[model samples]
Target: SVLASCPKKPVSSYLRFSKEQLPIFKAQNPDAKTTELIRRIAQRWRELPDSKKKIYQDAYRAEWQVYKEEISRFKEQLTPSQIMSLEKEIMDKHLKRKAMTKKKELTLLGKPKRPRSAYNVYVAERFQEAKGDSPQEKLKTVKENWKNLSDSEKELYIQHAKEDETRYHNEMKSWEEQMIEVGRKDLLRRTIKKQRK
Candidate 1:
């Protein structure tokens, strides 16, 4: 059987749907800006129940099956050395892609700085009270002082902490919107530090 060149694979059904939906969404929301339209479409996709999502998932799987068969048939005509070189090229690309993905996963840019806790804020003021102490010793003194605080004192700090948390989240939301506006969503990622065993 004659083997033709491998055709470019079909995009996943979700992408296909997004492409189809783009113009429709634009028409419906003529006043909507690019960022808002994209956000709404994404939210719509997210809100889709499993039954609706499965439709696209199954379509993607079917397309994937056809894609695999075509690639397999095309590969059959290649010489051993050609296959070896192709595999090497693919492996090199895969390694580069993996490295890029890991770098993205492990790094974050310009996230809202976490607000210091109320205890830390208090420490900033009273930390100097522990005069003649090393930074570490100052920290120890602070810890002991914190432990000795009454429940009412702790409660006040807790209230401040809650306010700080709210402020942090609001600041983060503004930062994300600005990032999106500037087409710098890559700078809005959160890095998850891996736990050391």
Candidate 2:
């Protein structure tokens, strides 16, 4: 009943208090070095003549009007490209703000989300270059070129190319078994799976 009857009055008084009392409140705080230095600012305001205070208030209001006018003029004068450029900056800032919030949520809730597989531009480029090429063709290219790679360089490609150690070892084992089976089957021959199926 109290909440229902409560008057939802405007906060103009609080806003005015914030504007007026901030300088006074800051001055009273002994630990506030900057405010302490500016302690006379509050006294100075009180000492000002009514005529001067009205002048200052008028000037302050004019500043707000000027700010609005400047923004309006800027929007009217802006070229399409300039507007797009400003919009891009705003969108970029929005994205960064979202990312920061997401990162905080991840820290609190555990690992927010992973980027897509294509997010790693390097991996995407490699995949693009290898597009339309057969798996055998890729493996053949890697084998022929891997010897020329430094140990560290070889590890880079191999790590991304293979899924897991167990799979890599299994592939090696299967390849060796196939070679042996082929040797027994004929003089020397290993056939791949039929393509275009």
Candidate 3:
């Protein structure tokens, strides 16, 4: 939440009309619910003339250009760690909104993506084909389907996994070594001196 002080994007032209009309509807239709007032507001905007439409269209377009300039300058004001921190929290909070269903994630930073387990490839291969009402059920179905798979496709996946597995090691070795050289060992593990000759 600390990271979200960045500007909110400008409202859409449609919403601009809605904002202008909502209170007008409310005063005239005092007993009507907010939902019904909004329905009336929506109808009015749809039927409103193009001459009137020009007001909001140009208004938001002009302001959105300003907004674009502002956010870019705002990002330039922060250091890389701050920039990374902002993005990381945005993603984590966004994930938390629906993350209870698929818990194990969010291992991200300036570093590279981690290798998917061979089992990871198996489920990803069949995730779409797997069927269920929710994502959690769908994942379970993938595991069940995996057990019934024939030999050819399984080997194909293992071969692909091995190839990516090497790519994972090569980069991680170089990347971790960089982390050590920079002496930012706080971001990594296994950065230690050799011992016991």
Candidate 4:
């Protein structure tokens, strides 16, 4: 009767998502196959061996600082676009954070690839090539290229740079405009998709 008389509702100090995803468990498999991947990862950490623990701990601590620094830098940029980019970066950093937290010394633990590398290797090669040709030559070439480049070629160069952003420079004003055009197309596609339903 006392159990039945207890209040039906209870209050909690913490908030939790009702839709939390859980690993399915099975009694037949003593190994707990449902969470096999996580279990294996944890086992690997446990088996890091006595010799490697100190080195692994040092490396893991450095990685923790790197992660912390990145988060701090990400936090500093407050504009909407910057914040969105930072959110993606923070989400991307989960793997790194997870590995350090778990003291994961195994071979396969790192953050998920958040976004495109945001690096421009090709453009870097281009710059190196241009610089190799001599600064005077590159300056002259850029000026001449600017004047003689066909309107189509000019447009294409800017578009390619915006999509790739390998060569960071202010000369891509035209390309910036081109990027706006590309974004507009994406927006139009979404609007049309909404209209279909």
Write the residue-wise lDDT of candidate 4 on 11-42 in tens digits. Answer: 11111111111222233355665457446545
* lDDT (Cα, tens digit) per residue for candidate 2, span 44-65: 6667688866766676667667
Best candidate, lDDT-wise?
Answer: 3
lDDT of 1 by residue, 1-197 (tens): 11224356888756876787889999988888978877877888888888999999899899889989978877887888877777777778789999988667435545576776979766876788875458888888888889899988888777877787887777777777778897887766465222221
Which residue pairs collide, candidate 2?
A: none
Report residue 117 deviation for candidate 1 (angstroms): 46
| C-alpha RMSD by candidate, in order | 18.0, 21.0, 16.8, 20.6
Which residues of candidate 2, in runs, are more than 4 Å off?
1-20, 32-68, 110-149, 152-197
In candidate 1, stretches whose alpha carbon ends up further than 4 angstroms from where it belongs are: 1-10, 26-35, 98-197
* Per-residue alpha-carbon lDDT of candidate 3 for residues 17-114, written as tens digits (9 for 90 to 100): 88878888888888999998888888888999988889889989999999999899888888888888899988998888777543332233346566
Question: Judged by TM-score, which candidate is best?
Answer: 3
For candidate 1, what is the TM-score?
Answer: 0.41
User: lDDT per model, in order?
Assistant: 0.76, 0.53, 0.78, 0.44
Error of 2 at 34 (Å): 12
For model 2, what is the alpha-carbon lDDT of residue 184?
36
Root mean square deviation (Cα) for candidate 3: 16.8
